[PDB]
Design a protein around this ligand. Structure first.
Ligand SMILES: CCCOCCn1c(=O)nc(NCCOC(C)C)c2cnc(-c3ccc(OC)nc3)cc21
Ligand SMILES: [Mg+2]
Ligand SMILES: [Zn+2]
Length: 324
């Protein structure tokens, strides 16, 4: 929409301080859609991406609105607000968490784009569901990280669309490198790839062998940072985290309803509204098994990332009081 582009491109962009986007405790709940788009421009601006990459304001504005438009409004959790919150957590980890200091402008550019694009056109159903219902997407990508390959395909489509080419000014070598980093960062959002690769990351930290100058270690770190940002709603102050967990559960139960109606199966506990009683004990298990070690490792990388670990520990204690 041309009208929405004009509304955004002609608007004054408030400061990062005013928008509170540097805060790990940030909440999008009170913001209007236009305000989330203004926050997004501010993220690109303050990470020196607009200046460094000579980005055309109108093009960046069109791209943000195209990304926002390509998230489904009938998806409870994996929608524009979650992608926006993931990017905000990336901005906070880069600024407040001091991750910016450890990466190049090209990596930062790729991470912010990947954070905003990582769930593009998420259908609100898991990879397993798409393989189960024999969906065309599952066939296109050989049942491996189906959604994640699709999110990158949607990301590229937007980047290649007329008037949305925010990378048009990059040199050919920079452009190819950025797309490769974006692709790897989006694929990293598949929790199966996080579990597969995390052991190597935790071992590198434990042995003090963690070296960001090594290209293989750099890619591994960017993958871990993507997961940390993706799951970051689990680290928010209790009331904010509780409201998002309700959306997470709503999406899982919506898939379960689809499985009951289309496949005639009793869904897995995670996807079964009738087994909503398992939520608190399952949240404790998931935080302990998946979340804590990741936030611990990121804090070892940069001490300033501690609020993510602190919030995760506080939420674990709260969910446990509900489950016990
Ligand atoms: C609330 C719904 C019930 O959650 C139960 C716990 N739980 C789970 O058991 N399994 C998940 N994924 C599939 C299995 O994965 C294995 C373990 C690798 C799973 C995925 N995401 C969340 C989540 C994320 C952010 C978030 O932010 C607030 N709140 C909850 C929780 C999750
Ligand atoms: Mg995803
Ligand atoms: Zn996500």
């Amino acid at each position: 929409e041309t009208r929405e582009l004009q509304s955004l491109a002609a608007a004054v962009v408030p400061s990062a301080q005013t928008l509170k986007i540097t805060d790990f405790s940030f909440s999008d709940f009170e913001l209007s859609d236009l305000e989330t788009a203004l926050c997004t421009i501010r993220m690109f601006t303050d990470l020196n991406l607009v200046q460094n990459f000579q980005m055309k304001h109108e093009v960046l504005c069109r791209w943000i609105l195209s990304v926002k438009k390509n998230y489904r409004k009938n998806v409870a959790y994996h929608n524009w607000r979650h992608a926006f919150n993931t990017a905000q957590c990336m901005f906070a980890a880069l600024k407040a968490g001091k991750i910016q200091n450890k990466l190049t402008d090209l990596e930062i550019l790729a991470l912010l784009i990947a954070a905003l694009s990582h769930d593009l056109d998420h259908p609100g159903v898991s990879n397993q569901f798409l393989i189960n219902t024999n969906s065309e997407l599952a066939l296109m990508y050989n049942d491996e990280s189906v959604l994640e390959h699709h999110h990158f395909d949607q990301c590229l489509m937007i980047l290649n669309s007329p008037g949305n080419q925010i990378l048009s000014g990059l040199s050919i070598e920079e452009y190819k490198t950025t797309l490769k980093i974006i692709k790897q960062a989006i694929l990293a959002t598949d929790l199966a790839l996080y579990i597969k690769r995390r052991g190597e990351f935790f071992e590198l930290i434990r042995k003090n062998q963690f070296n960001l100058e090594d290209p293989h270690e750099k890619e591994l770190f960017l993958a871990m940072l993507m997961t940390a940002c993706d799951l970051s709603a689990i680290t928010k102050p209790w009331p904010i985290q509780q409201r998002i967990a309700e959306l997470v559960a709503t999406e899982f139960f919506d898939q379960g309803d689809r499985e009951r109606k289309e496949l005639n199966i009793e869904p897995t506990d995670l996807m079964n509204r009738e087994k909503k009683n398992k939520i608190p004990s399952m949240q404790v298990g998931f935080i302990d098994a998946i979340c804590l070690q990741l936030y611990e490792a990121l804090t070892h990388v940069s001490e300033d990332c501690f609020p993510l670990l602190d919030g995760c520990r506080k939420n674990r204690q709260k969910w446990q009081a509900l489950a016990e």
